[PDB]
Design a protein around this ligand. Structure first.
Ligand code: CO0
Ligand code: CO0
Ligand code: BR
Ligand code: BR
Ligand code: CL
Ligand code: CL
Ligand code: NI
Ligand code: NI
Lengths: 287, 287
């Protein structure tokens, strides 16, 4: 059976329950085509200048991604559409608050644009977070998901051009001897549609088989504020940060965070006060 | 039987193995009396001006600590002795690399001076991290410790003045029906001695029974770089940060971090480069 498809408008309350059951759901029109167009236009140049993932120039090379893959993260300074429209997505925030209520506050572990070159091979079937957060492998099997991944199509996802594979129900698997491409279904998606998976969903990028098509996606890993992001916004200029909403500032680690503990003592606090109170960080200041 | 006592000089390799077995160890002369004297002198005024833990002025009040308790964190800007001597402690770094090798890089979750007023009541028996990191409760029982706590005496720890209680072996307990003050032994310590416990060691601050003695400690929670610190150094001036060693900068979240994954892709990275490379952060620059 196929990946459940849900409306961002009509089925909002059904999205997280669907992922919790099946380990994957397609959110049709997660981003409007206007937001996709502005996002694509803004990141275009940064994708073109991005070297190979394991470039000898990098002191944090990515040895896992194929040499044809280009990944651009820390999108806040690059993209007005990302910092304003995506970081304040009503649909994203409803799903994340549904997903992470047991733990507390959530933030962006990584927002990245990925462009796959023609003839990009299929990724091995995997769970995310295993190259950055070894801790997640030590969580009890039934522990609520500590991160989820919105794979947003920025170009068409087809069977031919390497649309994502998922194994439905694999987020609940402990024994992995049944892991095979035989067990997968595809995320066929229009630009702005999003495939939502958990950190336990077994999945992979598909094989690009046309030899002509370039596939692009926005991957948003949302995780509990108790886990360290893969990416830093420490070098984002304060003018850009102060142009954001307080919620967007929190998602980029420019605010203190709270756990769901009844008498929570907080994260990234400064002698009982928040980052934002201490540094007198203003919000929604046009540049 | 009593908490094992070890020399910082002679028994360095024995410290972590001792804690892994018994859940607690006393490191005699962890800090020299000179470092304790300079630390005490530097934090003295900040302890005196610190309001009650749950002060109505705070947007992150601590509702757990007794009203008599004063906790001062983000010590880097306050204390030269902390930022230089403590953050670069050869003994601390050997123990942390022994403790956290399975996970990867570690950093400071919180460095805090705590002063307990005369007649401070005993804390309830507890595990640390339960008011900040709900995630830790979902770790498999046998998961390696993701944080440890150095409770460094800055004044004498006596049975009379509320020396820490620990239950030896309690870091391996799953059933907690045997938790009682009957099962505890005391950390009797001279200034500069440290009680080392894990996030699973059942322990409590003791009852101050003299009505005259003020007890002070430096608590250093060291944790894997995959867990978010309780405290932020985001507001520490760049001059102070650039006065530190690269290792000290990493411990305060002013560097990218690495996991122990064979093909680690890193934490707090910026398009495959480190915070320190990106921002051209210099180190060991006198003010
Ligand atoms: C390596 N790797 C990434 O770089 C990555 C990229 C985008 C979003 C999350 C993410 N994290 C991963 O765990 C990851 C998985 C992965 C596995 C197999 C093949 C290629 C990737
Ligand atoms: C509340 N609380 C703290 O504030 C604290 C202080 C120093 C170092 C770590 C730390 N984290 C805790 O988990 C904690 C435990 C705790 C439990 C019972 C009573 C009083 C404290
Ligand atoms: Br993909
Ligand atoms: Br104590
Ligand atoms: Cl790839
Ligand atoms: Cl207390
Ligand atoms: Ni993946
Ligand atoms: Ni404690």
């Amino acid at each position: 059976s196929q990946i459940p498809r849900l409306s961002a408008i009509n089925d909002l309350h059904k999205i997280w329950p669907t992922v919790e059951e099946h380990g994957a759901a397609i959110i049709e029109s997660f981003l409007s085509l206007d937001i996709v167009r502005r996002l694509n236009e803004e990141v275009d140049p940064f994708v073109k200048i991005e070297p190979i993932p394991a470039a000898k120039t990098k002191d944090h090379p990515n040895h896992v991604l194929s040499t044809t893959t280009r990944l651009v993260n820390v999108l806040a300074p690059i993209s007005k559409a990302y910092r304003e429209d995506v970081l304040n997505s009503k649909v994203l925030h409803r799903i994340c608050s549904d997903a992470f209520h047991v733990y507390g506050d959530y933030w962006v572990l990584m927002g990245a644009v990925m462009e796959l070159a023609p003839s990009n091979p299929a990724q091995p079937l995997h769970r995310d977070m295993r190259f950055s957060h070894p801790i997640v492998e030590y969580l009890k099997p039934d522990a609520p998901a500590t991160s989820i991944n919105f794979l947003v199509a920025l170009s068409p996802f087809t069977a031919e051009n390497g649309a994502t594979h998922v194994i439905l129900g694999s987020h609940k698997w402990q024994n992995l001897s049944n892991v095979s491409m035989d067990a997968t279904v595809r995320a066929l998606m229009n630009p702005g549609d999003a495939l939502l998976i958990t950190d336990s969903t077994i999945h992979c990028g598909g094989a690009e088989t046309t030899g002509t098509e370039t596939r692009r996606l926005l991957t948003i890993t949302m995780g509990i504020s108790q886990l360290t992001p893969l990416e830093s916004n420490l070098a984002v200029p304060r003018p850009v940060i102060e142009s954001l909403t307080p919620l967007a500032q929190r998602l980029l680690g420019w605010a203190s965070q709270r756990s769901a503990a009844p008498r929570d003592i907080g994260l990234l606090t400064i002698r009982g006060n928040s980052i934002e109170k201490t540094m007198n960080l203003k919000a929604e200041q046009p540049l």
